[PDB]
Amino acid sequence: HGYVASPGSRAFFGSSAGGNLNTNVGRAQWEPQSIEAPKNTFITGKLASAGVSGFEPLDEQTATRWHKTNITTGPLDITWNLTAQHRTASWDYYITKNGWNPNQPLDIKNFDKIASIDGKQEVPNKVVKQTINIPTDRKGYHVIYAVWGIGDTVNAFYQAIDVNIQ
């Protein structure tokens, strides 16, 4: 189980692990690590919560709802913190396209896939640091969607991350 700690995920920032900076993240205030759903779950309006009961406040979406970490384009170091280390199948990353609507529910069709990293069925450390390429066209408020695919369960952990791209 785990979450993206850098840039802080939406769930992370709503929890004590992230300083309780985001408000009303439902269950993520107490269990940011538990956004667990089957692989290949990309339900419109349910990306941030992965459809998990009690995490629905994460699916709220306005231009001002969430804290947005400032980043640049180009290589971005992105760090997970794992509360339970599992053998890992994969790490996948997506980012919204310029012009996505920050006042409407999230839809994966409005994202591009930007990285896929093989986990090789290895057991990761509790801190996992990876580098992904933020496309150079991106500017403004965006959502990165990070997906940790577990090697020994049919599930993945899903992490929406709000950023402001300079």
Swiss-Prot record:
Gene Ontology biological process terms in this record: chitin catabolic process; polysaccharide catabolic process
* InterPro entries in UniProt: Cellulose/chitin-bd_N, GlcNAc_Chitin_IntDeg, Ig_E-set
Which reactions appear under catalytic activity for this entry? [(1->4)-N-acetyl-beta-D-glucosaminyl]n+m + reduced acceptor + O2 = [(1->4)-N-acetyl-beta-D-glucosaminyl]m-1-(1->4)-2-(acetylamino)-2-deoxy-D-glucono-1,5-lactone + [(1->4)-N-acetyl-beta-D-glucosaminyl]n + acceptor + H2O
Q: How is the cofactor bound?
A: The copper metal center seems to be reduced from a Cu(II) to Cu(I) oxidation state prior to binding of dioxygen for catalysis.
The record ties this protein, via SUPFAM superfamilies, to: E set domains (SSF81296)
Q: In which pathway does it act?
A: Glycan degradation; chitin degradation
Which sites bind Cu cation? H1, H86
Q: What is the annotated localization of this protein?
A: Secreted
Asked if the Swiss-Prot or TrEMBL record annotates the protein with the keyword Hydrolase, the reply is: no
Taxonomically, the superkingdom here is Bacteria
Q: Give the EC number(s) listed in the UniProt record.
A: 1.14.99.53
The residue ranges of the Chitin-binding type-4 domain are 1-163
Q: Which GO terms describe its cellular component?
A: extracellular region
Q: Which UniProt keywords apply?
A: Carbohydrate metabolism, Chitin degradation, Chitin-binding, Copper, Metal-binding, Oxidoreductase, Polysaccharide degradation, Secreted, Signal
Q: Name one GO molecular function term.
A: chitin binding
**Cofactor needs:** Cu(2+)
Role, per record: Involved in chitin degradation. Catalyzes the oxidative cleavage of glycosidic bonds in both alpha- and beta-chitin via a copper-dependent mechanism, leading to oxidized chitooligosaccharides with a dominance of even-numbered products. Acts synergistically with the chitinase EfChi18A, and combining the two enzymes leads to rapid and complete depolymerization of crystalline chitin, especially with beta-chitin as a substrate. Is likely involved in a chitin degradation pathway that allows E.faecalis V583 to grow on chitin as a carbon source.
Question: How is this protein named in the record?
Answer: Lytic chitin monooxygenase
